[PDB]
Amino acid sequence: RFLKVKNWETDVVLTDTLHLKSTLETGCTEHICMGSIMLPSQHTRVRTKDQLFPLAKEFLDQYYSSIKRFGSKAHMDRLEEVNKEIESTSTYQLKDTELIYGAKHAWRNASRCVGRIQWSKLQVFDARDCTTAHGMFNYICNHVKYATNKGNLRSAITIFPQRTDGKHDFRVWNSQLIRYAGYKQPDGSTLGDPANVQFTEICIQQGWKAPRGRFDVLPLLLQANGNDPELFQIPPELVLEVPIRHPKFDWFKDLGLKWYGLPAVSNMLLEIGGLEFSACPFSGWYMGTEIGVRDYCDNSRYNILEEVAKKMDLDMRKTSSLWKDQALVEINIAVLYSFQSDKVTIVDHHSATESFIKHMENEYRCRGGCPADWVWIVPPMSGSITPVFHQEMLNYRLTPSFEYQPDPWNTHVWKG
Amino acid sequence: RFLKVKNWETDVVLTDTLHLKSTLETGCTEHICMGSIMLPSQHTRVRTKDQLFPLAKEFLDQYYSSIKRFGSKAHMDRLEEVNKEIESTSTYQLKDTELIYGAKHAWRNASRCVGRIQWSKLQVFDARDCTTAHGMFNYICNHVKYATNKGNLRSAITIFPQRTDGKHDFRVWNSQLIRYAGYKQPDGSTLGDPANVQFTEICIQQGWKAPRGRFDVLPLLLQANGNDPELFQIPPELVLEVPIRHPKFDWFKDLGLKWYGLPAVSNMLLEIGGLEFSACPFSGWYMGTEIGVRDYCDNSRYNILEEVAKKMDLDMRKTSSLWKDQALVEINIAVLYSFQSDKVTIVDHHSATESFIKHMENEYRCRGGCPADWVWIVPPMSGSITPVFHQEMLNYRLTPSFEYQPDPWNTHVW
Numbered sequence A: 001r002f003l004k005v006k007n008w009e010t011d012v013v014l015t016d017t018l019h020l021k022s023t024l025e026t027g028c029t030e031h032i033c034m035g036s037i038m039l040p041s042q043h044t045r046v047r048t049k050d051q052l053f054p055l056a057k058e059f060l061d062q063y064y065s066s067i068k069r070f071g072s073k074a075h076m077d078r079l080e081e082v083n084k085e086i087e088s089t090s091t092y093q094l095k096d097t098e099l100i101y102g103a104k105h106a107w108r109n110a111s112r113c114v115g116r117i118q119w120s121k122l123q124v125f126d127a128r129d130c131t132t133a134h135g136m137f138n139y140i141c142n143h144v145k146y147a148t149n150k151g152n153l154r155s156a157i158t159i160f161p162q163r164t165d166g167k168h169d170f171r172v173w174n175s176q177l178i179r180y181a182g183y184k185q186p187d188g189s190t191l192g193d194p195a196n197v198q199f200t201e202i203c204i205q206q207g208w209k210a211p212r213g214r215f216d217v218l219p220l221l222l223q224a225n226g227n228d229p230e231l232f233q234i235p236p237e238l239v240l241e242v243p244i245r246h247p248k249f250d251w252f253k254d255l256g257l258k259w260y261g262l263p264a265v266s267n268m269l270l271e272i273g274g275l276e277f278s279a280c281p282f283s284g285w286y287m288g289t290e291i292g293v294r295d296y297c298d299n300s301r302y303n304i305l306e307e308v309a310k311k312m313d314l315d316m317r318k319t320s321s322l323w324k325d326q327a328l329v330e331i332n333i334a335v336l337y338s339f340q341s342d343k344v345t346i347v348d349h350h351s352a353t354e355s356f357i358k359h360m361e362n363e364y365r366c367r368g369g370c371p372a373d374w375v376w377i378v379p380p381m382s383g384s385i386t387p388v389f390h391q392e393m394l395n396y397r398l399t400p401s402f403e404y405q406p407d408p409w410n411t412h413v414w415k416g
Numbered sequence B: 001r002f003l004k005v006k007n008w009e010t011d012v013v014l015t016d017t018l019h020l021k022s023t024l025e026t027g028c029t030e031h032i033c034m035g036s037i038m039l040p041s042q043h044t045r046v047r048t049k050d051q052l053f054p055l056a057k058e059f060l061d062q063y064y065s066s067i068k069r070f071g072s073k074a075h076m077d078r079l080e081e082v083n084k085e086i087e088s089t090s091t092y093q094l095k096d097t098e099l100i101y102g103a104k105h106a107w108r109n110a111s112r113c114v115g116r117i118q119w120s121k122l123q124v125f126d127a128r129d130c131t132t133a134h135g136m137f138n139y140i141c142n143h144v145k146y147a148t149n150k151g152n153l154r155s156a157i158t159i160f161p162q163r164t165d166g167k168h169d170f171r172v173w174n175s176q177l178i179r180y181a182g183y184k185q186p187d188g189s190t191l192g193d194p195a196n197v198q199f200t201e202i203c204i205q206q207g208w209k210a211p212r213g214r215f216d217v218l219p220l221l222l223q224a225n226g227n228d229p230e231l232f233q234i235p236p237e238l239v240l241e242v243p244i245r246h247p248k249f250d251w252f253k254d255l256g257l258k259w260y261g262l263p264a265v266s267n268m269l270l271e272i273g274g275l276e277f278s279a280c281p282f283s284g285w286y287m288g289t290e291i292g293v294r295d296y297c298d299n300s301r302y303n304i305l306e307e308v309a310k311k312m313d314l315d316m317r318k319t320s321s322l323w324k325d326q327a328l329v330e331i332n333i334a335v336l337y338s339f340q341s342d343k344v345t346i347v348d349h350h351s352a353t354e355s356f357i358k359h360m361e362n363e364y365r366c367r368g369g370c371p372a373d374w375v376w377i378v379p380p381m382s383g384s385i386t387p388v389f390h391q392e393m394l395n396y397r398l399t400p401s402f403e404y405q406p407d408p409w410n411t412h413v414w
């Protein structure tokens, strides 16, 4: 059965056959669409030998198809070798090749990621020999340094050992490798990034000495082999930051804003052939609106719209002056200007959405489809003047995949 | 099965039980979300005697529930009376009360409509006695004049006779009562409104004399009882228009832009209790972005962005200057400024989306939920600085409903 999607701006129609290879569930039914549910139970992540070999077999079938070896003796022996290793040890180990393929395809399958044109150029760092939080710190430092590359960012992922009985997990307790602290003041106001208050408090409790600034880079909190997590300061010379200035407004620098250059998601779960990699930091480079629109302007984040609008001297009385929209654009121009001026890799939302359309069309032709979450692909500003707004998209889940998982501080059994 | 929706800007969580009353289908499955498909086969639309009575019962049941007379004599009496009429006539007729309720609730159930906080204040015009396109024209002029109200816009719907055997359909061939013409130029491009080029052809191609200007109000093309449709020009004094100027850029007025005040959708099908009202033009008032973002700036529409950015002397060399975004805001500032200045009702996207959150709150409290289509509720600019962006919404199809229907010219046994 075939399915068509139409671009209502260009009338291009594309036929999805890839959705037939969909295993996991969306969250929707014939009678309810959960398309805007943020983290439905299906996107979040204790797995026995019973269901594991089918998951292994399908991954390996995919893998050997991509390398044009489906049904080869190499393919059959690997299936055999995996089968016996599962029944003998209740799990199995991916070869290096399989790990690299898995990690790339997980990104390729990330239906919410507008950045996927880049999916084949992923630097995969195998940290499966890691055993301690200190060893995790070292792997993450090398990741950050390689990825940052003095501003010329390179996509990378570092893969720590897979889950076994779920009692010995490797977890990075930070949502992202580099994030600013947030402090709840007694007067109710927040200093720093309000999204990080809960995490900041954990770090402080774990012994972090907080400078209590507006842009304190948080320490790494690292759990190895299911042990209690341990604090580590990322070396400051490894955290590349960009002071934010505006190309026409000289008063903008005096807002004291900066942001880090390396977006690196560290709290997601990488699933490859039934194996669960609970610690798999990955990184790329920023789309400008992630900082300019969400980080700075969300009411529940730094929320500088008011101050920026005040300094532009906009009509802030009625909303219908669109003072909020006017300031948002200027803040986002500044983010882009500052990164480009400092030669830190960044993409504006127009370029990124156009690229994703090309990627998506290419994927329908070479792959039979491209799963895409419209709710997430459309940028959080100027949506309809980017070409993804007008693009019908089919959302379905392929594996390998990145899944959410509960924050470890809610599931961890503390040792002491 | 008793579902929760979370707002991520406020942590407010609502429990939806209304979705359990859902009847029609979404187009999604457990394996695939079609939440971004414009027109799945369900949202588009003869009824047999067996299908019609359950549809009527369900509608009448909710109707008599809403008037606190469920399980009453009048309820059972009406139930049997409609039951008798179906068995006899293979259809039935709504009492005016049920018609008004049906219309208001088709709006209330429109999961893609952000303006539904107003749903109960709908002015329903019963046009079921209409028999001719001239008659249809008269009802539509009365609708337009009532709805416009000298710029103090009022919601209205006018309901023409229901479908019978699909051979006697009433249809308004226009997609909106008021739309600008679109003509393809000999030199390649498109003059006026490119969305309307085929229809603008069918008008000329059926007798219209086109001014071939850039903002020509299209004529009405009215089809009664399945006959060939007829051309009628809306009296210009009924078409309230706003010249678009900017409160900072005096050159803005020289762009020659204007828009009409009355958004009046005329091509949808209104379904009440299994009955199909194929001609049911309805109208309210604009959210600013509908004109400024979509009408003026879509590349498949008036696409004035490049011209406006030029006049602002923005750096259009690279997309990273965000000149498109900068101009988009200015254009939308101007639309709001103009409508407000001329005292024509308009809501900005910040005001309308806040209203819709309040409406959601109201519906979850007093009804148990509110079906909503995030892909359509989120404005086409500044999405995340509006509250609806961070609002989880459940989308499901309730009836009475507005549905899409095939364009008449594809269908009309000419």
Ligand code: HEM
Binding pocket: A103, A107, A110, A112, A113, A114, A115, A116, A118, A122, A155, A156, A157, A282, A283, A284, A285, A286, A287, A290, A347, A352, A376, A402
């Ligand atoms: C290289 C440049 C990249 C850009 C510009 C980019 C952009 C984005 C953006 C804007 C989002 C929306 C999420 C949000 O707004 O919070 C997203 C989501 C996502 N990205 Fe990418 N990304 C990039 C690289 C990567 C890489 C290297 C990976 C993994 C290997 C990745 C995996 C994902 C995933 C899994 C999501 C889903 C988030 C979720 O489900 O919550 N991205 N990306």
Ligand code: HEM
Binding pocket: B107, B110, B112, B113, B114, B115, B116, B118, B122, B155, B156, B157, B282, B283, B284, B285, B286, B287, B290, B347, B352, B376, B402
């Ligand atoms: C009173 C002010 C109103 C406002 C501000 C408003 C706003 C909107 C907007 C912005 C959309 C998105 C569609 C698009 O972008 O083209 C929409 C859709 C819709 N509106 Fe409302 N609307 C209003 C009144 C009404 C009324 C009076 C009705 C009928 C009684 C109605 C029924 C609908 C329906 C059915 C849709 C979606 C059509 C579909 O399913 O694709 N609206 N509205």
Ligand SMILES: Cc1cc(N)nc(CCc2cc(CC[C@H]3CCCN3C)cc(F)c2F)c1
Binding pocket: A115, A263, A264, A265, A268, A282, A283, A284, A285, A286, A287, A290, A402
């Ligand atoms: C590699 C990379 C490049 C890039 N340009 N941007 C990113 C960040 C995108 C992103 C964001 C989130 C959580 C945000 C959600 C979770 C709950 C609250 N927030 C709304 C998870 C992800 F996996 C992810 F990729 C990553």
Ligand SMILES: Cc1cc(N)nc(CCc2cc(CC[C@H]3CCCN3C)cc(F)c2F)c1
Binding pocket: B038, B115, B263, B264, B265, B268, B282, B283, B284, B285, B286, B287, B290, B402
């Ligand atoms: C009464 C009213 C008030 C108001 N502020 N705006 C409107 C117009 C919005 C609208 C648009 C459409 C279809 C347009 C679709 C079809 C394919 C291309 N377009 C995406 C149907 C509707 F029912 C509708 F209301 C009406």
Ligand SMILES: C[C@H](O)[C@H](O)[C@H]1CNc2nc(N)[nH]c(=O)c2N1
Binding pocket: A008, A389, A390, A391, A392, A393, B036, B037, B038, B375, B376, B377
């Ligand atoms: C493909 C996609 O469904 C299409 O562009 C939709 C997206 N959301 C929309 N939302 C509104 N309000 N109006 C629209 O026309 C659209 N178009």
Ligand SMILES: C[C@H](O)[C@H](O)[C@H]1CNc2nc(N)[nH]c(=O)c2N1
Binding pocket: A036, A037, A038, A375, A376, A377, B008, B389, B390, B391, B392, B393
């Ligand atoms: C409720 C809604 O799903 C939620 O706010 C989503 C919507 N789309 C998004 N899209 C992106 N890129 N990032 C986000 O955080 C969100 N949040």
Ligand SMILES: [Zn+2]
Binding pocket: A028, A032, A033, A034, A035, B028, B029, B032, B033, B034, B035
């Ligand atoms: Zn869905």
